[PDB]
Design a protein around this ligand. Sequence first.
Ligand code: 2RB
Ligand code: 2RB
Ligand code: CL
Ligand code: CL
Ligand code: CL
Ligand code: CL
Ligand code: CL
Ligand code: CL
Lengths: 151, 149, 149, 151, 149, 150
Amino acid sequence: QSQFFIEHILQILPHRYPMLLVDRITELQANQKIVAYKNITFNEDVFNGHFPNKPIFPGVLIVEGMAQSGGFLAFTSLWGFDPEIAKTKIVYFMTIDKVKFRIPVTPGDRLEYHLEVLKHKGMIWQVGGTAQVDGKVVAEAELKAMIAERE
Amino acid sequence: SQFFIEHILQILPHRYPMLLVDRITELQANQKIVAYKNITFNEDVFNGHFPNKPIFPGVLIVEGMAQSGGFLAFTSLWGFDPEIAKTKIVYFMTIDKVKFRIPVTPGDRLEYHLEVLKHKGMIWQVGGTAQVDGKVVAEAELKAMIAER
Amino acid sequence: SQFFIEHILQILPHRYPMLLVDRITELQANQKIVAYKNITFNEDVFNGHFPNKPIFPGVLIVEGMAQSGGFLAFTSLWGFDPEIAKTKIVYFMTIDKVKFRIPVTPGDRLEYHLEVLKHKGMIWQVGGTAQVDGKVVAEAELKAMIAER
Amino acid sequence: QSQFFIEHILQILPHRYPMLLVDRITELQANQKIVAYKNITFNEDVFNGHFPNKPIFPGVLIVEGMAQSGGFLAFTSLWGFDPEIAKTKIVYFMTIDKVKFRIPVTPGDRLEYHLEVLKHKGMIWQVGGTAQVDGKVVAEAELKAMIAERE
Amino acid sequence: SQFFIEHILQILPHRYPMLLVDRITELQANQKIVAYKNITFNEDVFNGHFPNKPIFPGVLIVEGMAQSGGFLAFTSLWGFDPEIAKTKIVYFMTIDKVKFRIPVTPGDRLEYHLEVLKHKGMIWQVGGTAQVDGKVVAEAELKAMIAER
Amino acid sequence: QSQFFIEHILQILPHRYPMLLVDRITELQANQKIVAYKNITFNEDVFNGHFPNKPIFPGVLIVEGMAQSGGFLAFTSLWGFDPEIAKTKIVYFMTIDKVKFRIPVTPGDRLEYHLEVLKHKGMIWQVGGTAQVDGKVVAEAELKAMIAER
Ligand SMILES: COc1ccc(C(=O)N/N=C/c2cc(Br)c(O)c(Br)c2O)cc1
Ligand SMILES: COc1ccc(C(=O)N/N=C/c2cc(Br)c(O)c(Br)c2O)cc1
Ligand SMILES: [Cl-]
Ligand SMILES: [Cl-]
Ligand SMILES: [Cl-]
Ligand SMILES: [Cl-]
Ligand SMILES: [Cl-]
Ligand SMILES: [Cl-]
């Protein structure tokens, strides 16, 4: 109810490889906040192109990870932990604002997502927060996403 | 004013599977740039976004816009110079005012329209839209920095 | 008469990285089909064909025409029937008169134009060309047999 | 200069993963013929999509393999094992005729290419032959290739 | 006594890129198994092991032997039962006495020879060699456990 | 001298994607021991097949990661951080012994390799140790390698 592992994440989020960017959830408060993280390793395909000989986890993917964290929070806050309801849902990005990248994320980093709900109404959730590595803010972002039934 | 994939490759450091611009159709130094990327089902990203429902990631649309803006920045600074380019990389600094209006899917020709908002040194702030068949599919503003590897 | 990736996924058994048709623009039962696949640098195939010079494989151009031709033969007899589609398998027996005239590269919209040359029972012979912006880049003739999966 | 292993093939053909479809060359006679093969294993990305639950090596890739074999033959017939010149040349299909797929190719099969030189004048090479598995013809084809400049 | 990839897929839980057994050529319940995996350049592993010098990772050879053992272990206890197989996975418990004598490269037919040293319930202990053209390229002993998925 | 990041590992080991299984080196004592680690994330191709709906880092890859760490230890003991000499060397692993798996490794785990030189005779190096996640031993292993000219 407050801590979830990759198996639980796979039953809630529709995202899959190579776009499931959340490995574990450490803190979860319904309608309120979520703390999760994704391990960053060299053994990830994106590193073949970003950049050759200089592995830098793409900033936009950090945003994606925060969004997915927000989505997990949004879903469980809505229907609780229900894989059956979740398997036919998808998530759409509506907006992204105030994104600032301060420190590059590289292989070996534990990218921690901290997101708080700024406002939600039905299926539309607007979250905002930071991504941290070893306690330091590596990025900050604000985004609004919509959960939608697969049509 | 047409730059093809082999030209883009000589300027941008990005490579597979993060090189998201296939061709440059228009270029005007310190002003604007129009480019595009073809979207096909035969892209690994679609295996997971989403299964049975291919939607080109909104964040990758923004990445493509950033890269387009990057090409504009590189050439505006040093002209088409492969030698200088090979020592640089690019970092995302900020992203703002992005809105997605229509989902981009396999079969779409994703066209990037970026104009220079402000710039100085290696720091470039551009903004514009992403379009499919003449309709705005997304809006975005972003600031990136060019740097030595 | 226009089918999108979602529809194609329901008729063809092909999946990544071998589903080479992104969208169907037109189709006349027992007569012809026009379909296409977008070519983008963001495709795994370009890693090896070739390094520093991306050229869409000619055999894959032919594979794309085949898939289009199969979609044609299938829908002509059964229409858009996902259920029946799973009970059937369209495989190719022969390929002839293949000619490559122009290389296909990232940024190109590879259009498949096939017409039914002849058909008898489950044996369907299709032929046509592959076009990029109105010009013929390849041509070929193929014969397929439709069988129970 | 009748047997060549992957290290030698890599020095002659420009093809790389996932389009280098020749693993070894067992017989080679200048201007006359070549015998080579490609091992087929389930551990190949193509099988993820061709097809799910039913691994079948794409017929067009069988043709591609015959062509690469033919190209190696054409090049070495003209310049011998010359890696430096190989990287300045490239072979392209001009045409493909009389392709017949007789038996499906699947993981565990050793796809053996048998190409014979039907006609050659300068950079223009016409070859034809078969693809075999355990002595049986699984496919046949003819093709005309062009040895062109890389730049 | 022989099983093809279609059969293996139905028994072992491994999938791409970790199903490293292609065909079973010999099987004696609770005693031994001979199988093999074709090695080809067209495998992703080779992109990193190593550039311009493809060598099939020694640890993957052991993995292949384990998988063969797992196939032996399961068919010995349930025969060819796809329904009960999909409810299990295999867990590596120990590895011992492995020696790598000859490098394995593209074009090689990696043959697995395993015999059960001991077995008790879901716990199976096998040992043997990996052969290429009749020569031992590797040796190993390992203990695995079949567990409820 | 004691801390190496991915850029440094890339200049010493020949391994590349998808077989470079060491992300960072936290500590190194020439001729004695090495502590390093590889983050485990779901966004790795191997998890597509090991296993579907049940991601478990392959036990053999933990052993491979340990071997890589040993090789970096051996190499750096001999010539220190030297990319140029690194390109002319290779270390093949001859044997692997006494490996035991105690706890499965999964996405979200920080797989920490702990290797120590058990014996160094000529071109032969024997290393051994454990793989740990959050202080617990998840795997043990002994391995022998040989240093040779590329
Ligand atoms: C004569 O060369 C051949 C080429 C392809 C085939 C073939 O069987 N293709 N596809 C077969 C097939 C595909 C799916 Br999907 C499936 O589920 C099943 Br049952 C099939 O037999 C047979 C012969
Ligand atoms: C030309 O690149 C090569 C790299 C490695 C080899 C090889 O067969 N095995 N291993 C090499 C290798 C090198 C380092 Br240094 C190392 O730490 C480890 Br472990 C290795 O396996 C051969 C060729
Ligand atoms: Cl970035
Ligand atoms: Cl999106
Ligand atoms: Cl081609
Ligand atoms: Cl086929
Ligand atoms: Cl090895
Ligand atoms: Cl395991």
